[PDB]
């Protein structure tokens, strides 16, 4: 029963726990497997398929890591500013912003260090040809679902 202006204690350790598990899982796949290897988790529906993502879906681009770099930082700053200005007394949105912040930072570390992103989650639950993603992608998607539910107020 705590009603605070900014739930900084809950928001940060949510971001802490997400980044830790994203970076750890990414690192476990990098050191136990080779690119292209795959082992099953839940048969016929979830595999751990080692992949690396460097934006090759967009085709030829002069420098995209720099553009991803500028994009991620601009959005990371806006999330903090969103957190302060319009997320007051609203734990639900502050959690969502944290999920958005943590999911962006987790991938941000991958690109800054290696110039790539470790992708290992390979499922057929969302149909096939759905790309291999990771925890940082999952936190972002969940954070978008929550704000879409938060955007579905006044309607």
């Amino acid at each position: 029963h705590m009603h605070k202006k900014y739930f900084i204690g809950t928001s940060i350790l949510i971001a802490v726990f997400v980044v830790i598990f994203d970076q750890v899982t990414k690192y476990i796949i990098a050191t136990t497997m080779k690119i292209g290897d795959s082992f099953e988790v839940i048969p016929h529906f979830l595999n751990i398929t080692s992949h690396r993502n460097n934006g090759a879906a967009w085709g030829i681009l002069s420098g995209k890591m720099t553009f991803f770099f500028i994009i991620t930082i601009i959005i990371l700053i806006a999330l903090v500013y969103f957190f302060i200005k319009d997320a007051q007394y609203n734990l639900f949105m502050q959690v969502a912003i944290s999920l958005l912040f943590a999911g962006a930072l987790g991938n941000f570390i991958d690109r800054v260090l290696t110039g790539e992103v470790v992708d290992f989650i390979d499922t057929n639950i969302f149909g096939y040809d759905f790309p291999i993603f990771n925890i940082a992608d999952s936190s972002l998607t969940i954070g978008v679902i929550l704000i879409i539910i938060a955007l579905l107020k006044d309607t």
Binding site: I71, N107, V117, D119
Partner: peptide, 4 residues
């Protein structure tokens, strides 16, 4: 933000 996302991997790609």
């Amino acid at each position: 933000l996302i991997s790609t």
